Design an enzyme around this catalytic site. Structure first.
Site: not given
Ligand SMILES: [Ca+2]
Length: 223
Positions: A40, A62, A84, A171, A175, A177-178
């Site tokens: 999704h 990064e 999913d 919980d 955001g 999600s995944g």
């Molecule tokens: Ca950063």
């Protein structure tokens, strides 16, 4: 993540952020060129961001890599959220180090009672909204198939498990999600859906990764 804690920079080195101008989903690095997420979360124009802690500040560890291909599970049902799961290939391989690392796929399914680590940049409040800039963590047990089905009558398939607290308060949320659910060093779940966040008797529902190991391996081997 509601009722969690601040992970610490780069303590969850397999965690990824999916970015289309803004953070919109999490994911997990499973080898130097493939990310697993929720189906999704699908959209075009994804950039994968590795080594993140504060997603609004460049901090030094990064790696930003564009997606070259996305593969949604062949049997994904957007209405029921069965199956999913989705794979994303990176245009080039990531540079693996202590702060950017892959997570192993499971060889067996985890049992109820196993303690797991859930992480993400999702909403931290059960009413209202406040989105964190740094990664949040949560320790939660896997719940029994029977308590999961009692919380969500008619909605749980064999490709789902519940994790969390029936009392509420803790919980995943919008955001997250995944993102990953990691138990004993193995990727066991994917943040999929819930009824609100941290509500009493409504724990989060997660895609059951151990059901998909063969499809992941064969897909990766041929793409
Ligand atoms: Ca950063």
């Amino acid at each position: 993540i509601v009722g969690g804690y601040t992970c610490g920079a780069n303590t969850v080195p397999y965690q990824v952020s999916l970015n289309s101008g803004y953070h919109f989903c999490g994911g997990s690095l499973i080898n130097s060129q493939w990310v697993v997420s929720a189906a999704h979360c699908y959209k075009s124009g994804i950039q994968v961001r590795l080594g993140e802690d504060n997603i609004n500040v460049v901090e030094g560890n990064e790696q930003f890599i564009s997606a070259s291909k996305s593969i949604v599970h062949p049997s994904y049902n957007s209405n029921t959220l069965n199956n999913d799961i989705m794979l994303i290939k990176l245009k080039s391989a990531a540079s693996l180090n202590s702060r950017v690392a892959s997570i192993s796929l499971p060889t067996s399914c985890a049992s109820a009672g196993t303690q797991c680590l859930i992480s993400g940049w999702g909403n931290t409040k059960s009413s209202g909204t406040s989105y964190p800039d740094v990664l949040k963590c949560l320790k939660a047990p896997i719940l029994s198939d029977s308590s999961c089905k009692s919380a969500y009558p008619g909605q749980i398939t064999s490709n789902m498990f519940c994790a969390g607290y029936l009392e509420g308060g803790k919980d995943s949320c919008q955001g997250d999600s995944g993102g990953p659910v990691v138990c004993s060093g193995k990727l066991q779940g994917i943040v999929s859906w819930g009824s609100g966040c941290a509500q009493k008797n409504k724990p989060g529902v997660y895609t059951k990764v151990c059901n998909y190991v063969s499809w992941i391996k064969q897909t990766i081997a041929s793409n």
